[PDB]
């Protein structure tokens, strides 16, 4: 037989939301111990992966996903992966941008759940350049109060003094061209994005919702970090939770409504694409990925049995 | 904002089974209708749909995939889509191939589940020159017996005869330059594939097992058409399926086991890449897809260098 070819397809997948235009972008994995980074037992743990196949022991492997939304009006990257901050299994979701049809330079907003690593650090090219040149950032003013905050880093714990760092080094370019902005909860950022509250996970961290031709896209940040576990017991917390009991709440909050309201997410840790539904169980909560799809334009003649 | 780009990702996805290579196929969609195919109440199923959020009216969207498997020893495309017998919808497969780095010319083996056109069209270009021109196709006997046999197909409903006549289409070429093999329910194919007998969809219909390092892998065919139903309800039939009570059986006997044992299941027509393990439930069970992932070469090396 012939070479193994190995490869994997490229990491980006297309998505229509009413007249919006949703491209899912991989950064790609992290190895998470799922030991602590928790707060539960660990025979229903182990109950919890092995029922959705999720291999722990060398860590439950992990996608960061980010999400690239272009509206007619803007082209919006919401979170922007790891680059190098995390190792070499991250800081792909440029190339995959670009493999999906983009161009960095195209991007006009670049909206933040939060600052962790995973989130911002893809603002920033390996040579120090901004990733996304012609971009605004927007930060939630909570989340740039804290991790930009130079007090605050110094009476922080060395183990997250990196991640202090990391944040400063990533919106650095765009402060210095003025391209940095942090926002208050009022006024809604662009036509068709508003925002929804979601601390905890960290001080600030912020959810998007986009809405277009009677559809609704909430793109969530870190409301949740492993699907195997967390929808099935909400009251379960993450380690680097800054604030776990408050972030539990915002996750108990929003699991209620997007399952009540039946509306489209796009969670950064949840298996890519990271799109799908959220259905109420009778204890927890279930993850229903979308199923692969073109985008059905023929379909979208809803609009002549008006 | 510049123009949209519109296009998705091409429909092919890798996955390591031992030392084999796996390459799930998109072939595209067809729009099936939930009722007439089934065997529960309306509202039953609709709710079974709802919960997977799973739009019906205008019709339930559905996958059809086929899969390449490099074992090393063989290159083999298990099923090969619809080609064009079906409509622009579909008949991917072999551009979704070409995407994933292979060529047509490299595959020296085609395993059939069953003759259906979704399954069988595939094999030959628009053209009417073969598809896989180095390839020898695999079918079951029971398979051929049925689909290629005139007198069959003379007194077969007129509804089923198009079927017939595009399952000769397909296979033509092949049995031209005798590279057409039908095989019985023993002897084994290739090194790494065995038989799993699933008759009922269609008389012949066979599941392919692939076995390497201690991993297997289910190419099931068609024992199931809709993942938000009849996993949870495997007792709910399909309106084409051949002989409906023997296709719950085999149904039946294959979930319980891929349940049990754990096997990877490669699926025809559950959401692409089809990938991914079988759950027993309280009442059936759930279908658990696989989550996107390289292949971890540095996961397979540490296994092997560990015990
Ligand atoms: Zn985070
Ligand atoms: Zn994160
Ligand atoms: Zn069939
Ligand atoms: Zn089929």
Redesign the pocket.
């Known amino acids: 037989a012939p070479a193994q070819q190995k490869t994997q397809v490229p990491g980006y997948y297309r998505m229509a939301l009413g007249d919006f235009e949703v491209t899912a972008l991989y950064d790609g994995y992290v190895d998470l111990p799922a030991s602590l980074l928790k707060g539960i037992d660990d025979k229903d743990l182990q109950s919890l992966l092995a029922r959705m196949f999720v291999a722990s022991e060398k860590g439950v492997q992990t996608a960061?996903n980010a999400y690239l939304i272009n509206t007619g009006d803007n082209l919006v990257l919401i979170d922007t992966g790891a680059a190098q901050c995390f190792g070499p299994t991250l800081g792909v979701v440029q190339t995959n941008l670009k493999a999906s049809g983009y161009q960095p330079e195209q991007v006009d907003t670049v909206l933040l759940t939060?600052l962790?690593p995973?989130?911002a650090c893809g603002l920033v090219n390996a040579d120090g350049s901004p990733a996304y040149p012609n971009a605004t950032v927007e930060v939630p003013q909570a989340e740039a109060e804290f991790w930009l905050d130079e007090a605050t880093m110094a009476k922080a714990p060395e183990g997250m003094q990196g991640m202090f760092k990391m944040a400063r080094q990533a919106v650095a370019p765009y402060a210095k061209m003025n391209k940095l902005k942090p926002y208050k909860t009022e006024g809604e950022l662009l036509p068709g994005v508003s925002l929804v509250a979601s601390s905890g996970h960290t001080p600030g961290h912020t959810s998007y919702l986009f809405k277009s031709g009677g559809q609704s896209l909430l793109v969530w940040?870190?409301i949740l970090?492993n699907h195997a576990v967390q929808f099935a017991k909400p009251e379960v917390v993450w380690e680097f939770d800054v604030d776990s009991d408050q972030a539990r709440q915002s996750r108990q909050r929003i699991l209620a409504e997007a399952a009540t309201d039946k509306l489209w997410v796009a969670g950064?840790?949840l298996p890519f694409p990271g799109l799908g539904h959220v259905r109420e169980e009778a204890q927890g909560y279930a993850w229903v990925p979308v199923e692969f799809s073109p985008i059905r334009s023929d379909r979208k003649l809803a609009a002549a049995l008006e």
């Open positions: 960061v939060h962790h995973d989130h940040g870190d970090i950064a840790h």
